[PDB]
Amino acid sequence: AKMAFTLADRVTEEMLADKAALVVEVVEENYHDAPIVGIAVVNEHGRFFLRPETALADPQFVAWLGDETKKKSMFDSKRAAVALKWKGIELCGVSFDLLLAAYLLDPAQGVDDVAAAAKMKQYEAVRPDEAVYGKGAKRAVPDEPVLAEHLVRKAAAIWELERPFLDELRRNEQDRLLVELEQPLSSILAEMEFAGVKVDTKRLEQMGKELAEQLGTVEQRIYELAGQEFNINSPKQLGVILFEKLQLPVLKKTKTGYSTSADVLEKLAPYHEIVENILHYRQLGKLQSTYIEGLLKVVRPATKKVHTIFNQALTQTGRLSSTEPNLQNIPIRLEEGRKIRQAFVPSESDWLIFAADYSQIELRVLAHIAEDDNLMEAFDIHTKTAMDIFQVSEDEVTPNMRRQAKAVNFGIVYGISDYGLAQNLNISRKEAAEFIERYFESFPGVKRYMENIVQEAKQKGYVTTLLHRRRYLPDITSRNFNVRSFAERMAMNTPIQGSAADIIKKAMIDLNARLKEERLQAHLLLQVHDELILEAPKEEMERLCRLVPEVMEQAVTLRVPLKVDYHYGSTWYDAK
DNA sequence: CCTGACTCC
DNA sequence: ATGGGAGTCAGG
Ligand SMILES: Nc1ccn([C@H]2CC[C@@H](COP(=O)(O)OP(=O)(O)OP(=O)(O)O)O2)c(=O)n1
Ligand SMILES: Nc1ccn([C@H]2CC[C@@H](COP(=O)(O)OP(=O)(O)OP(=O)(O)O)O2)c(=O)n1
Ligand SMILES: [Mg+2]
């Protein structure tokens, strides 16, 4: 702990070297329109701290941030890039991101700050962020000398750690994953987050007013049926009503008491009509609390946009997640909740929403990977399963039936048991067991594959995706049944979900390149795991109908072709 | 603050 | 004991 640095009053030439570690510090977790509290630069010439008020109003420093030929190493460069966009400054030339490097080396470490990354290489010359800024109501920027040292120490760590991390990624054959996929993706995600999605608040507010009335109506009906008022949103109070007052059968318990899960309640429907009303009430309550009230809370009022943050270094399989607000779990399955999507509108007059999704991309990936003839030949496979489990005609398969059969296809291939399946379809365990057995004989390649991948994980201690993403599974040889079994099912699932994640990431990169090449105004707004959502002038729809599916299809080559479905409309709802 | 709800892929 | 991966909310 002895680190020399200049606390600079003004930007100098030697801070603008062609390679540098750069820290642009934002303390708030949600970095949209958040204060930049300090800057640190480390390069061959030395270590510098700059006050943002100075640096960011300095035309040479701004010029250097925006010069792609001046290469910067950082940690969480998307955070910096977006915070700078909100200050009206363009950040270019990021060549190394320690956050993403750590994530690829081992997603389980949960690396969230430079110190946590530094620990991976026994680098101790830097403090965790939480130790410097503090928690909750105590959270604050420290005295300048202490802030400056922290930011310089983070930059020095990035400076020293770049090579050891790159060296290890190369050993793992993952450097291209970092440099050619994840880092370019981060810049595209930064663009999407900053663009935001426009919301029709008048529509959303009116929906909430009508939902309020309907909640009250259903609530009173529940009270009438129960013979008493109680808090329907307390599973504890509800448990007393259902299982003590009304004396309904107890099908399941958790550590806190009687289960009132949707699965349990649906099975109690033939006992008392109050359970169906309660399920509906909790659905309506979620719509209001989360997708009306929670959404309106994060709308920026002047522009009516919502700006999600896509976490690129969180999931254990290589998927993104979306927070504050989560735009990857907007309702769609019930028409009631689906109507929320009518409030998601284009950001400009005479623009439209364009949505494109990979049709069953994951199952095609498994077909390719497991090398299964029957599955490939099938390449509707979900509808086909609903004809089987419900024993019906193809033109009698309701979108609820198909939805149920999709859950069965994914259940089975990823190791559901006879018990789970029996519960899911409310059928006999014998019948469920024979359903699973039949599936594995119908597709013997999938069967062989799932056996092999588990043994491979036991031998190596990890599993990998098509583009060499890695998940370590140290629990996989555990003496404990439940613990071992979970790890076995991650070996079955992670390579396929993770590979499907790799592919759509590549597609986003490819797509943006083409949009730029063709000088289109169309741009990405959202990714929802197997779907890309764009907005564009209405004139570009014709072109987008060919371009976007073209690019997605040709992202990778597999034994099975990738298929893209696409729709467009006035609102997200209408993009179906 | 965690748990168990509901939401999506 | 009992397919996988996520985030947000009210209650307690
Ligand atoms: N140094 C490397 C090499 C590869 N990869 C990732 C990028 C794409 C994917 C493909 O691996 P390649 O060796 O480029 O192609 P391959 O012939 O299919 O090799 P393999 O079958 O082992 O994946 O792995 C990487 O991240 N870093
Ligand atoms: N119950 C589910 C639902 C989805 N997924 C994963 C598997 C596929 C991926 C995309 O989900 P969907 O788009 O709903 O599945 P799909 O096969 O593409 O079916 P559809 O044609 O209806 O989109 O997410 C899963 O593991 N379990
Ligand atoms: Mg799909």
From TrEMBL:
Binding, Mg(2+) 3: 358, 530
Binding site for Mn(2+) 1: 357-358, 530
Molecular functions per Gene Ontology: 3'-5' exonuclease activity; 5'-3' exonuclease activity; DNA binding; DNA-directed DNA polymerase activity; metal ion binding; nucleotide binding
Keyword Transmembrane helix recorded: no
Residues in 3'-5' exonuclease domain copies: 4-170
Residues reported to bind Mg(2+) 4: 530
Binding positions for CTP 1 per the UniProt entry: 173, 175-177
Residue positions binding Mg(2+) 1: 357-358, 530
Signal peptide from the UniProt entry: none
Coiled coil regions in record: none
Entry binding sites for Mg(2+) 2: 357, 530
Binding site for Mn(2+) 2: 357, 530
Residues annotated for CTP 2 binding in this entry: 319, 360, 362, 382, 402, 406, 414
Binding positions (dCTP 1): 175-177, 468
UniProtKB keywords: DNA damage, DNA repair, DNA replication, DNA-binding, DNA-directed DNA polymerase, Exonuclease, Hydrolase, Metal-binding, Nuclease, Nucleotide-binding, Nucleotidyltransferase, Transferase
Boundaries of every DNA-directed DNA polymerase family A palm domain copy: 337-540
The EC number(s) this enzyme carries: 2.7.7.7
Any GO BP annotation: double-strand break repair
Chain sites annotated for binding dCTP 2: 319, 360-362, 382, 402, 406, 410
EC category: transferase
Residue sites binding Mn(2+) 3 per the record: 358, 530
Catalytic activity line of the entry: DNA(n) + a 2'-deoxyribonucleoside 5'-triphosphate = DNA(n+1) + diphosphate
Zinc-finger among keywords: no
Family: Belongs to the DNA polymerase type-A family.
Subunit structure: Single-chain monomer with multiple functions.
Protein name (database record): DNA polymerase I
Lineage: Bacteria, Bacillati, Bacillota, Bacilli, Bacillales
Segment of the intact protein contained: 299 to 878 of 878
